C-alpha cells in the first residue's frame, strides 16, 4: 500500500512542475519574433555526390576540418571520404554488417562504429602501418547501440536500446558512468559544445538532459505523442531540437524547462530521421520519410526551403562546423553535399 | 589530370583501387543467400542451428554451404529489447525461417499463466508476416518436436488450445489443423508463399527443404526481374 501513496506523491510533484511551467509561460516565441523579417526562399544546390556504397547508408559524421566524412552502410564497411575532391580516403571492413551509427574523433585519429552486435568498435586511423586497425572493442550493453559520440580521444558517450547510456574509457575498456532512468529504448544523442552535458532522446517520448561529470539526470522533457528519433543541440547550448514520428519538430528550452516552439505542417505526415542546425541557428534542417529534407525557419516556423533528389528514405544530415555545406545520406546508397 | 598535382593523382589512383575492392566485395556478397531466423524462445531453434552448422550477446551469424550455395543465417534471439526499431534492417533477405514447437500448447507462458504459448507464437507470426517491410519475403515454417507432440496429443486433446475445434484425435489431423491455422493467419496470399515442414532427426532432409524453398524464391525473383510477370 506504500506504492500507491508514493505514486500519489509523485503525481503531486508532477502537478507542481506543471504549475511552475505554466507560471513561467509569460509569452510565446512566435508572438515575440513576428517583428523579424523572414529568411525568404532558401534554394540550396547539390554540388557533390558521393558514390560507392551498395546497401543502405545509416549514419554519417563530419570532421572538425569540415573536409572528411565517415559513412556507415549495411555493406559492412566504413568509408572515409574527402569532400572537396570526392576521393575515398579509407575503406574499413567491419566485423559485423549491422552497423547503425558512426562517429569521427575531434582530433581525427579514431573512428567508432556499432550496432546490433551490441559492441562498440573503435578504430585507430593513424598507424605506423598502412592499415586501419581495431583499437578497442567495448562491450556491456545488452540492447542495440543507437548512437556513439566522443567527448575527446579517451572518452565515449554510447547510448543503446537497453534504456541506458554509458560513458566509456578506452584505455581501461570499462564503463565509468552509467546513466539510467529512461523507460524506453534510446535512439539519439546530442552533445553540448562545452562537452559537459548531453541530451538523450528515447522511445518513451521524453528527452533527458544529463550531466556527464556528476552522472545524475538533471532535466526531463515531454510533449511528444510518438518516439524521439533524432535530437540536436543549438549552438549556444541553451536550447535543443527534437524530431519524432509525429511529423513534428520541437524546439525545447534548456533553462526554462519548456517547449518553446513546434514545427509542423498539415501535408507532412511522415516521420523524421535526422535533425540539424545551421551555424547561426536560424535554419533547422530535418530529413523526413517522404524522401526529402525541409529547411525550417527556426524563429518563425515557416518552411524556408525543400532539398530533394533522393529516391528513398533520408537517414542522416550533417552540417559542417564552419557552416559551408550540408551532407545528406539516405537509403538509395548515395551521399549528397549541398550548398 | 593536368591541373591535378602528383599527390592528387596518386590519391585518385588510391580511390580507384578502393573502388575496385568495393565492387569485388559487393559481387561476392550478392551471391550469398541471407536467411533470418525467428520464433519464440522455447521453439527449439537451437536444434536446427546445430543441424545446419554441420553442413556475450548480439546477432548470431551461422555460415554454411550446401550444393555450392552459401547460406548466412542470422539469429536475433539474444536481443529482446525491441522488434520495431531494427527489423527494417532485415528488409533485403531472401527468406525468413520461422520456427515454432508443437508441444507448446500444453505449457502456459512463464510471464503470464493465463496466456498460452502457442497463441503467443501465433501473434508473433501474425506481426512478422503482416509487417509492411516483408510484403514480398517468403516464410519457411518449421514445426519442431513432433514426437513430443505425439506423446502429448495421445494423453491430452487439442481442445485445450482451440476452443472451437471438432475433429478426430488423430496425430495427422491435429498437425494438419495447426498448419492450416498458421497458413490462415497470412493476409498476403498472392505475394507471399509459406513453406511448412515437420522437423526430422535426419540432418540432410531439413537442409534439402531449405535449399528447395530458396531455389523457388530465387526463381520467383528472377522471373520478376525478367518481366514475365
Amino acid at each position, epitope marked *: 500500500s506504500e506504492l500507491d501513496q508514493l505514486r500519489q506523491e509523485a503525481e503531486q510533484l508532477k502537478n507542481q512542475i506543471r504549475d511552475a511551467r505554466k507560471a513561467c509561460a509569460d509569452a510565446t516565441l512566435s508572438q515575440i519574433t513576428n517583428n523579424i523579417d523572414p529568411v525568404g526562399r532558401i534554394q540550396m544546390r547539390t554540388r557533390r555526390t558521393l558514390r560507392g556504397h551498395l546497401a543502405k547508408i545509416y549514419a554519417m559524421h563530419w570532421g572538425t576540418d569540415s573536409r572528411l566524412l565517415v559513412s556507415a552502410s549495411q555493406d559492412g564497411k566504413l568509408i572515409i571520404w574527402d569532400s572537396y575532391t570526392t*576521393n575515398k*580516403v*579509407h575503406a574499413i571492413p567491419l566485423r559485423s554488417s549491422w552497423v547503425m551509427t558512426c562517429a569521427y574523433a575531434p582530433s581525427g585519429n579514431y573512428v567508432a562504429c556499432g550496432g546490433l552486435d551490441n559492441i562498440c568498435s573503435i578504430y585507430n586511423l*593513424k598507424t605506423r*602501418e*598502412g592499415n586501419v586497425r581495431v583499437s578497442r572493442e567495448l562491450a556491456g550493453h545488452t540492447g542495440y547501440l543507437s548512437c556513439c559520440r566522443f567527448l575527446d580521444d579517451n572518452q565515449i558517450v554510447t547510448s543503446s536500446g537497453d534504456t541506458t547510456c554509458a560513458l566509456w574509457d578506452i584505455e581501461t575498456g570499462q564503463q565509468t558512468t552509467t546513466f539510467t532512468g529512461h523507460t524506453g529504448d534510446v535512439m539519439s544523442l546530442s552533445l553540448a559544445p562545452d562537452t559537459r552535458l548531453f541530451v538523450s532522446g528515447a522511445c518513451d517520448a521524453s528527452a533527458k538532459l544529463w550531466d556527464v561529470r556528476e552522472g545524475m539526470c538533471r532535466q526531463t522533457f515531454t510533449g511528444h505523442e510518438s518516439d524521439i528519433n533524432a535530437i540536436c543541440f543549438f549552438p549556444n547550448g541553451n536550447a535543443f531540437a527534437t524530431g519524432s514520428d509525429d511529423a513534428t519538430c520541437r524546439l525545447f528550452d534548456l533553462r526554462a524547462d519548456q517547449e518553446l516552439m513546434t514545427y509542423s505542417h498539415d501535408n507532412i505526415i511522415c516521420g523524421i530521421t535526422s535533425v540539424s542546425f545551421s551555424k547561426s541557428g536560424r535554419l533547422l534542417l530535418a530529413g523526413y520519410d517522404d524522401f526529402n529534407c525541409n529547411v525550417w525557419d527556426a524563429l518563425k516556423a515557416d518552411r524556408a526551403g525543400v532539398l530533394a533528389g533522393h529516391d528513398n528514405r533520408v537517414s542522416c544530415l550533417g552540417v559542417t562546423d564552419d557552416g559551408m555545406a550540408v551532407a545528406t545520406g539516405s537509403w538509395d546508397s548515395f551521399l549528397k553535399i549541398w550548398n | 589530370g593536368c591541373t591535378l598535382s602528383a599527390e*592528387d593523382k596518386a590519391a585518385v*589512383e*588510391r580511390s580507384k583501387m578502393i573502388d575496385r575492392n568495393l565492387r569485388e566485395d559487393g559481387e561476392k556478397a550478392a551471391r550469398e543467400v541471407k536467411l533470418l531466423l525467428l520464433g519464440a524462445g522455447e521453439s527449439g531453434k537451437s536444434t536446427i542451428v546445430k543441424q545446419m552448422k554441420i553442413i556475450t550477446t548480439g546477432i548470431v551469424e551461422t555460415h554454411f554451404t550446401f550444393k555450392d550455395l552459401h547460406f548466412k543465417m542470422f539469429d536475433v534471439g539474444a536481443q529482446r529489447s525491441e522488434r520495431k526499431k531494427w527489423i527494417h534492417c532485415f528488409e533485403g533477405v531472401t527468406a525468413i525461417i520461422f520456427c515454432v514447437a508443437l508441444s507448446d500448447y500444453d505449457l502456459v507462458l512463464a510471464e503470464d499463466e493465463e496466456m498460452n504459448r502457442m497463441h503467443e507464437s501465433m501473434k508473433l507470426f501474425d506481426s512478422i508476416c503482416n509487417n509492411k517491410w516483408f510484403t514480398d519475403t517468403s516464410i519457411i515454417l518449421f514445426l519442431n518436436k513432433k514426437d513430443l507432440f505425439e506423446e502429448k496429443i495421445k494423453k491430452s486433446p487439442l481442445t485445450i488450445c482451440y476452443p472451437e475445434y471438432a475433429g478426430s484425435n488423430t496425430y495427422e489431423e491435429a498437425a494438419a489443423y495447426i498448419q492450416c491455422q498458421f497458413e490462415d493467419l497470412n493476409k498476403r496470399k498472392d505475394t507471399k508463399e509459406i513453406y511448412t515442414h515437420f522437423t526430422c532427426s535426419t540432418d540432410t532432409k531439413n537442409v534439402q527443404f531449405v535449399f528447395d524453398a530458396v531455389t523457388d524464391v530465387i526463381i520467383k525473383n528472377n522471373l520478376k526481374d525478367c518481366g514475365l510477370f
Partner: single-chain antibody
Amino acid sequence: VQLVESGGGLVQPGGSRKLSCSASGFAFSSFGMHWVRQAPEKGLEWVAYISSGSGTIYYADTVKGRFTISRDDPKNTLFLQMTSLRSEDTAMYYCVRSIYYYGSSPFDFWGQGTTLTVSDIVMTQATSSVPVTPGESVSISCRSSKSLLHSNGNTYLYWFLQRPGQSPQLLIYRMSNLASGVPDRFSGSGSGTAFTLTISRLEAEDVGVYYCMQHLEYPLTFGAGTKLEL
C-alpha cells in the same frame, strides 16, 4: 617497420645486377615505393617509383632504359634490375616507403641501403657549412627555381636529416607539418620560392646533413645539402 636491401657488391661495367628489398612489419601492398641513390660525397639522387597497385611507374632521366623496377606483393619484396652499368651508377641504394592520401606523410621510412661499386625544378641550397655553437637556433635556406604553391594551397616541400652513419630521416613535410616521432624544436616556413628550416635548442643528436626536396612534379629533385657541425 623494417626494410632490408640485399645484393650490391663489385660489378664490372656493362654487367647486370639485381637489387632485392624485403619489407617487414607493415602492409607493403598499400605503399608506393622509391629508389634513391647517394654517391660517396655527392647528394641524394632520385631513381625510380612504383605505385601501390603497380599501375604507374616513373624513372629518372638518367636511368631510363637501363633500370627495371618490379613489385612482388605476396612476398613483400622490391626488385630493381640493372643493365648497362657505368661509373656514375656506383652509389648507396635506399628503398623509400611512401603513402599518398589527404593528410598522409610520405617518405616516412628509409632503408639501410646497399653499396654497389662499378670499376627540372632546381633546388638551391647554398650554405654548406654552418659553424654555430650548440644551444642557439639555426636557419637553413632552400631556394626553389619556381613557385611550389599549387592551386589547392599546398606547397610541396620536404626536409630530411641524414646524420652520419644512418639513413635519411624525414623531419618536415609540406612545411606546416611535423613528422611523427620528431621533437617540436624543428619548424619551418616559406613564401613559395624561398624556404626556411628553423631549428631551436641544438643538441648533439642534431648533427648531420639536412636535405631539401621538391615533390611538385616528376622527376623528384634534391638540394645539395647543408652540413651542421657541433
